[PDB]
From Swiss-Prot:
It comes from the Bacteria. Pfam families: EryCIII-like_C. Keywords: Glycosyltransferase, Transferase. Transmembrane segments: none annotated. This is Uncharacterized UDP-glucosyltransferase YojK. The keyword Transferase applies. The keyword Ion transport does not apply. The gene is yojK. InterPro entries: EryCIII-like_C, UDP-glycosyltransferase, UDP_glucos_trans, UDPGT_MGT-like. Its EC number is 2.4.1.-. Belongs to the UDP-glycosyltransferase family. GO terms for molecular function: hexosyltransferase activity; UDP-glycosyltransferase activity.
């Protein structure tokens, strides 16, 4: 079948969608993936028709974020529809957090599926998990009346079916694939059968082979990454250089793309410091993961039964951090308590710790049991089959 896929601008969005595209393609499907230019190689790598839309990141108040996401919906929906209108697609997949995806699905009159790369969210989750506060009342919010104008226009002119603010950021398809298990998902019981909890979507990405695996293959490996988004971090990597310099093995520091490695302090002789690592392959070989608590890093780590130390900074990280504390699989350091000493003690406590390893194994196994990129494909293709046979029953007119 012909599949329109519309991604969201961020690596933690794109990465889990790779497994599902790769599973769908190896089953006969031709895919057209829309993303921002940054992540092209990640899609070209799969041998999948790549296409672009304006990166709206390069251009925290709740009502402003609603309006930015509606401006972008309108631009993406217009741009993408202009290009796809004459093409023959059988269904659309899109990032749960990209409303334009649901709008494209409505303009093509096709079956659609959302991929949720965070925990599943309903009205019982705080705005703060999507990285927004309100100072006081919604009325006195600066973009309040703008939100009411744009939502209204997108409903009338774009079939955006926005009944509620949260519908801007949580765009349910006919199904919502969620990349966690009901086990790990807080308030799992509040999500019906249209939420398919498939756990993490793990498969070889391309770019991996450059890293020297032979240096870490028969060694203890401490892996550290604060993600792909939380910079302001040169301070923290400097602290990692001092805390871990006498580690008895290899320390793999992924510092991200906005900090030159020469801008840090002296690298000890036992460190491999890169802007980007093949995280899946590093986790395969890692004893311990010091992570920011990003949904994907956290659930990639547990998938490899890696005990964690989680230093959460923003967005959903507090909620995922707390889920790691809850299931026994790791230990959280609050930013306010972060110090070289407490970083060193926390790593020494969790390294090789029988109790953290057991609990990491349990939740790791809950997450694998959810069926992964494979389950995402069975569930989607089966929904498509039923709606095709349903709609293909135009043998009355
Ligand atoms: O050096 C790195 C750093 C990050 N990642 C990937 O980037 C994504 C980060 O998503 P997460 O939800 O953990 O954090 P965010 O960066 O979105 O805060 C994950 O799939 C990681 O495997 C990677 O491959 N190599």
């Amino acid at each position: 079948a012909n599949v329109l896929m519309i991604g969201f601008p961020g690596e933690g969005h794109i990465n889990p969608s790779i497994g599902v595209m790769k599973e769908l393609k190896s089953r006969g499907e031709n895919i057209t993936y829309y993303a921002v230019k940054e992540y092209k190689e990640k899609i070209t790598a799969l041998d999948i028709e790549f296409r672009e839309y304006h990166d709206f990141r390069g251009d925290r108040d709740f009502t402003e974020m609603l309006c930015a996401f509606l401006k972008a919906c309108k631009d993406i929906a217009t741009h993408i529809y202009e290009e796809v209108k004459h093409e023959s697609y059988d269904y659309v997949i899109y990032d749960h957090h990209l409303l334009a995806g649901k709008v494209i699905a409505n303009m093509l009159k096709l079956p659609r599926f959302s991929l949720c790369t965070t925990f599943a969210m309903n009205e019982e989750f705080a705005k703060e998990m999507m990285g927004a506060y309100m100072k006081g009342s919604l009325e006195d919010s600066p973009h309040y009346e703008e939100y009411q104008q744009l939502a209204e226009t997108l409903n009338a002119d774009f079939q955006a079916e926005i009944k509620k603010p949260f519908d801007v950021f949580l765009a349910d398809g006919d199904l919502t694939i969620v990349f966690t298990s009901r086990g790990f998902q807080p308030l799992a019981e509040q999500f019906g059968e249209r939420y398919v909890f498939v756990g993490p979507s793990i498969t070889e990405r391309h770019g991996n082979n450059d890293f020297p695996f032979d240096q870490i293959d028969n060694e203890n490996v401490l892996f550290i990454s604060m993600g792909t988004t939380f910079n302001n971090q040169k301070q923290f990597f400097n602290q990692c250089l001092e805390v871990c310099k006498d580690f008895d093995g290899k320390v793999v520091l992924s510092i991200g793309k906005h900090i030159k490695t020469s801008e840090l302090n002296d690298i000890p002789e036992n460190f491999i410091v890169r802007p980007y690592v093949p995280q899946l392959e590093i986790l395969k070989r890692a004893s311990l993961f010091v992570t920011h608590g990003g949904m994907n890093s956290t659930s990639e780590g547990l998938y490899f039964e890696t005990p964690l130390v989680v230093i959460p900074m923003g967005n959903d990280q507090f909620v995922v951090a707390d889920q790691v504390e809850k299931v026994g699989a790791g230990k959280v350091i609050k930013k306010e308590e972060l110090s070289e000493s407490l970083l060193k003690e926390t790593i020494q406590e969790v390294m090789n710790n029988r109790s953290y390893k057991e609990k990491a194994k349990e939740i790791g196994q809950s997450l694998k049991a959810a069926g992964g990129s494979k389950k995402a494909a069975d569930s989607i293709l089966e929904a498509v089959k039923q709606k095709t046979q349903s709609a293909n029953a135009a043998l009355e007119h």
